[PDB]
Amino acid sequence: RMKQLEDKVEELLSKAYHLENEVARLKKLV
Amino acid sequence: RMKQLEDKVEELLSKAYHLENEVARLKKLVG
Amino acid sequence: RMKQLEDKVEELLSKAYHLENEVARLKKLV
Hints:
The structure is a homotrimer. Chain A is mainly α. The first copy, chain A, has one domain (about 1-30). Chain A contains 2 helices and no strands. Chain A has helices at about 10-20, 25-30. The first copy, chain A, starts with 7 loop residues before the first helix and ends with a helix. The interface of B and C includes residues 4, 9 and 22 of B. Chains A, C: It is found in: Nucleus. Chains A, C: Belongs to the bZIP family. GCN4 subfamily. Chains A, C: This is General control transcription factor GCN4.
């Protein structure tokens, strides 16, 4: 339910971390 | 109270997809 | 349990927003 939801928030965390490790790559390189 | 929470986890779910998408485009157009 | 899930979820809604801008400024500088 919530182990399913702290799992949702689990997936979104993983994702925003990669999304910054990249938006911050581009940013440098571009 | 689940309405709200299980609806914002939609707003962000959406947006993780757009952005994943968008970043990827940029990455491609900048090699 | 819930608050936590709404702690999480709120923060993420503000990282989320900061990144959306980021990808437009980027979008333009290209």
